[model samples]
Target chain A: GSMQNTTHDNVILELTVRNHPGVMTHVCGLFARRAFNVEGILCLPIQDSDKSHIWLLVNDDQRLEQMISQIDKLEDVVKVQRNQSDPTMFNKIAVFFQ
Target chain B: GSMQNTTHDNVILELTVRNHPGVMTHVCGLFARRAFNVEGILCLPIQDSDKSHIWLLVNDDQRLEQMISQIDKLEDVVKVQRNQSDPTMFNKIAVFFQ
Candidate 1:
């Protein structure tokens, strides 16, 4: 039984992209035009490397899978995939704010 | 002398904006167009509210203040300012990924 407990209503998109000025703007544009609010995001450059990583949190919706594929196709995006890490990992940000 | 510790090489731009999809893209574009790489970024919604907060880390340079001013003029922006919070708050993302 693959009891994948559907506990959270949101999903995380993890992206590896070139470490450059336009990367975030271009990657995020995919979500913006669709009117899909990206609830959480954490981006940082990889250690002494030419790439950066972006983690985005969004609602589990019909358009999300399609959205990820489009984001993956962008020029600066080296890779993009869904992350199943507990949604709380993102909520930890709220804690960091406190 | 009230000393401001210029211990780090980058500055953080803190922004309060409408909790919508286009907000990030429009805000980040200001940096992208200028070829300023945002070294770190954290974006999250304000606890069940209509506004989201954005924190961007970039090198402390002559263009930053001007960049911030341009971003504040965007329609969805509620507020924009520099965050003196330790740049390490952003570096923490690297830890989270590990």
Candidate 2:
């Protein structure tokens, strides 16, 4: 009996978009529109410029690619893709319980 | 002297929205448009493909119920309830510091 691969693992979506105007809303709406459930979202501003980094988590890989392709079409979206397997990138979400 | 409640706590918003078109956009837009700071958001797919579970974290409780009511007004929103307020249901979120 082959249990096969019933296990499911989470995937991370790293996005870098301009801080101008409504980029955040545009990118997030793009994800939601695709029916890709966003498990977690983190937005952080970079330097003093109009640029920010967004970290989004989703379980479905297929939807992620679709979302990425759409994001590439956005003018404000500079870069977007799956960064979980990148050695240069690190994904660590620390939660402290007190 | 009464303390001013210096200890600011976090509020959890539990939501159930249909897995339909532009549903997430409307919900998240309501928050972003209002300039409400969202610390975190969590979405989980439920039993049906068109139903989902969403949890959001915000610091302001004043507008919490307001948002809930607005969600109820949505055509796709089935039910909107505050999980922690009523003892009728039990909810918990445990984070392990790893």
Candidate 3:
């Protein structure tokens, strides 16, 4: 499987979603159907709560703006916040695996 | 929306999968249908290649043994390795956010 690497500028989409079955699938399906490649993903449960935080590393583009709206509309997604200030979350973690 | 936290012992399931549309959905869907709660997730592309590496933080149990077999059958999953020695990768990263 040859995954194409995108050169488009990237940002992080921080999401607060209800933790449940199918939420991750719904979120990833939206991007898959659009042929949008998500560069990195970090999802963790909120401390002492039922909600989870999701951070998606993706290309910053017109399509992403629309994508965020779709993600927001999902039943389990509570909020979607876009952050362009720092997209290096994944980069920093990658070092540990190396 | 209330996600239950599991008290079962945990393990890290490391997967090498082909990077393509629907792959993540397929993987996540398999567990979702089983009502399995994935505690944490980390996915990143393998540098200079078309393949991606996915690390799933999940509870360790008999059910998971069967789950691993199901995951192995997925078309996009090339390999699935279980590690019990260190399930704290996510714990380490969580500190950065704090």
Candidate 4:
């Protein structure tokens, strides 16, 4: 296990599943069991088909690789990627203070 | 509660919020409170800013209005719009069944 300052590091996991009921639970549960904090998750069914796009945000480096490795083994996982330090590949999050 | 025979109604909600912690939790909890099946939720942070964009797909037209109203009242919420008929406002979801 690699220990680095990953407290605020956010990793995005994007996947496409054959859109169906309870699929999100199956995928999200994997992260929960691995003790990773899923900062945010979103899965939406694609138009003109039965597939859904799923994305997850995680910040625990101690167990990041382990969790992602486990998720990759799932039968329904279409594609998965790790986005780190790539601003072009990230979805912007803003917090404007008064 | 308004009741209509809507089973697969996918409502797209797009909103920008004043950056804050746990704002997503506050929004998601509103749906969980009413036992509405939140099909999918996607939140991405905007580039070069502190605001996050969220997209949610829900299946119940019966409780959508209530849920939307409740979410619109949150103090952290900056802008809220219902992407009901906007086809261009959605992200593609694909399910390539084998």
Candidate 5:
């Protein structure tokens, strides 16, 4: 069960990674180096496991599967999956500002 | 309003940045270059605007304000503020997994 994609045809890339400082660095650096249009990102630790879940909102004007493959190649990335999950996850979080 | 520090004492750094692809790359690079302990990260777009919010959960075992200053200097960063907002934000999102 996942959130729906944004009308812009954006997909969510979900990653389960080790809970470490460099994990996000590795993940983001990979995207940054490729100029991937990662619009939104979220991470939270698993309650019992020493793992963290990272959710990325992105656009695939580019080849998405190849990008997902690259992310999976990362050292800290345990799993990387892409599906048409709800993009509203980001929309709801936006409410914290005001 | 802010969240309480974990038993480990972490702070949240909120960043409003231009809605672009490379913003996260620059941010994680800044942290990776300096070896910051960013335990968690979250980002969402600002409604009706070309701006996004990047929230980082980090440990200030090292100098933190300096890091905030560094993030603000980035070309795409609109603002970087440190406050103890509700860390339960992450806790709640984690529920989505199970």
Candidate 6:
């Protein structure tokens, strides 16, 4: 059974960052330190550029706003945008696995 | 454009590890230090358990076997399994975003 279909409580954080080694580690480390579990992640390199787009799926919690502020302060992270439109992004991915 | 359709060169490395803070950081840091770009990542928590299953989509290169050995040695990593059957797991996820 696919549990992904029941993911409405999550939000998407879209980020643009420098596409370099250790960048992802730095980003994931931020959440890990706070004991935040990222439910899903999607990262793609922007074509013909030295940047990448990362989408982090995480629970909608009170601390998330502060988390966004911290993520914004990272050196490699260019921008962080919270999106509610694509809440089903992970659910869509789970369709294939189901 | 969906570039994910051409992912035959990639392989899926599925890992089972203790679910805790800093675990994902430790895993991603290993690959980042080697300048290995993880094409895709899918991590899901096991039902009713304190463990997580992480799937990494990466290029099937000569050094991957060695990488697996290193990943296996990680204290939190319980097991690492390489699978050729799900090379398109990331591709399927891409279809949703594209």
- Most accurate candidate by DockQ: 3
TM-score, cand. 6: 0.72
By lDDT rank, best first, the candidates go: 1, 6, 3, 5, 4, 2
lDDT of each: 0.69, 0.53, 0.67, 0.56, 0.65, 0.67
- Once model 3 is optimally superposed onto the true structure by TM-score, how far is the C-alpha of residue B8 displaced, in angstroms? 6.9
Docking class of 2: incorrect
What root-mean-square deviation over C-alphas does model 4 reach?
9.3
Q: Candidate 3, which segments miss by more than 4 Å at Cα?
A: A1-8, A91-98, B1-8, B91-98
DockQ for each model: 0.48, 0.21, 0.48, 0.15, 0.43, 0.43
How far does residue A58 in candidate 1 sit from its true spot (Å)? 0.8
Across A13-92, the per-residue lDDT of candidate 2 in tens digits comes to 77767754445567667766665545444444343455556666555555668768888788777777775532112223
Q: Which parts of model 4 are misplaced by more than 4 Å?
A: A1-9, A14-41, A46-53, A58-98, B1-8, B86-88, B92-98
Candidate with best lDDT: 1
Give the Å shift of residue B62 in candidate 2: 4.5
Candidate 4, B-chain TM: 0.71
The TM-score that candidate 4 achieves is 0.52
Q: What's the residue-level lDDT of A28 in candidate 5?
A: 71
Taking all chains together, each candidate's TM-score versus the true structure is: 0.79, 0.55, 0.78, 0.52, 0.77, 0.72
lDDT of 5 by residue, A1-98 (tens): 11244365667778888855566777676566655546677776554566777778876646566767877987678888877756665545433321
Positional deviation of B40 in candidate 3, in angstroms? 0.6
Residue B66 lDDT in candidate 3: 81
RMSD of each: 6.4, 7.6, 5.1, 9.3, 6.1, 5.6
> Quick one: ranking by DockQ, best first?
3, 1, 5, 6, 2, 4
**Model 5, B15-68: lDDT tens per residue?**
888856667877776666655545667776664567777777766645467767
iRMS (Å) per candidate: 3.5, 4.8, 3.3, 7.7, 4.2, 3.1
Candidate number with greatest TM-score: 1
For residues B1-98, write the lDDT of model 4, one tens digit per residue. Answer: 12143333556777776546456655656655655445556665553455666766665466677878888899878888887632124334111100
